[PDB]
Amino acid sequence: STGSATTTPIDSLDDAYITPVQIGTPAQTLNLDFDTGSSDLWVFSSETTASEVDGQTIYTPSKSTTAKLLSGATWSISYGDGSSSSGDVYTDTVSVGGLTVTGQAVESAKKVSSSFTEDSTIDGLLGLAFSTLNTVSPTQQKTFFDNAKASLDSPVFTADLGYHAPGTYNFGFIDTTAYTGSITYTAVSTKQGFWEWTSTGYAVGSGTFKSTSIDGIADTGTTLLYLPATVVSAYWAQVSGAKSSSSVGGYVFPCSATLPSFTFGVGSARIVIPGDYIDFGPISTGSSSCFGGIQSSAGIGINIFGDVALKAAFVVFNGATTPTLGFASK
């Protein structure tokens, strides 16, 4: 089997991407944030505290003839940005782009943090990291991809995120028309439950490529590119007037600036992020100071190849017995 679904930016800045997902019988379609940095499929629901729902579409398990309460199961998650959610668990039929999994754990939110309430466009998350990170207790549950894998034509999914435009998540096949050149594959460590890999270096604009190992995670659920402070300082030094602002919480730059590209290495291959992918617009409405899309990871504990980086590539998440990642230009 295969599946293919369009993923759409939630706003004009590409702050996140939403993908329609069919849950239950009859189908209830919710727009979920596909997140290769986490491993829970959770949704706003008829059980979510009413004051914490503000425009989201909800899953109502009582209206699904295939929903079954997973007795005794609860979940609770906290994300790297400080947001969180928790609740109980159903199993139900879940379909993405024509690919159907029966008995998928659907984690129904009883509580969500304010950042989720305030984002009316995201109805939940669909985790695509390794199932070892799933938070369901006392019996950990499998991700959608883990449940689908054995049925897929090939045990892979691909992320093709657009810049200011829709893109595609495919399951079970590699669309050879969706990229240019070849796909370069690179080793993955699953020891932390992430799609963790080592970039071979970087360049700023037309500058020379610096060969240096940068360990980080491929994370579709993170907006920005978080890299070591040395790398990030080298980037922003090429933007007149850019500075790190403690009050704003990262590098800002004059909105009148032209941003240089940023290149990252995948083996001997190179992925070029155009400068305009690094512009996240005014820090507040009407400001002439703009927020940068490349930020320091120093306060995180891990480097994160988020959407800024991933949207410049066609990315293969190869879930074979020994997982690997592939990157192609497009």
Report yes or no: 115 and 84 within 8 Å, Cβ to Cβ.
Answer: no
Residue 311 phi, psi dihedral angles, 5° rounding: -70, -15
Domain extents for the chain?
A: 5-174, 175-330
Q: What is the CATH topology of the domain spanning 175-330? A: Cathepsin D, subunit A; domain 1 (2.40.70)
Give yes or no: 35 in active site. yes
Same fold, 5-174 and 175-330: yes
> CB burial class (10 A; 0-12, 13-18, 19+) of residue 228?
middle
Among the listed residues 293, 258, 263, the one whose alpha carbon sits nearest the alpha carbon of residue 278: 293
Structure tokens at 21: 């997902």
DSSP 70-110: EEEEEEEEE-TTS-EEEEEEEEEEEEETTEEEEEEEEEEEE
2 three-state secondary structure:
coil
Q: Architecture of 5-174 per CATH? A: Beta Barrel (2.40)
Among the listed residues 98, 108, 95, the one whose alpha carbon sits nearest the alpha carbon of residue 40: 108
Which residues have CB under 8 Å from 327's CB, separation 6+? 183, 184, 186, 266, 269, 271, 313, 314, 315, 316
Name the experimental technique.
X-ray
Residue 247 phi, psi dihedral angles, 5° rounding: -70, -40
In one-letter notation, the amino acid at residue 124 is G
Distance separating alpha carbons of residues 327 and 9, to the nearest angstrom: 21
Experimental structure resolution, Å = 1.0
**Count of alpha carbons within 13 angstroms of residue 261, beta-carbon side:** 15
Tell whether omega for the bond before 274 is within 30 degrees of 0, i.e. cis. Answer: no
Residue in 14, 35, 40, 92 annotated catalytic = 35
**Residues facing residue 171 across a β-bridge:** 3, 157
Residue in 199, 261, 296, 297 annotated catalytic = 199
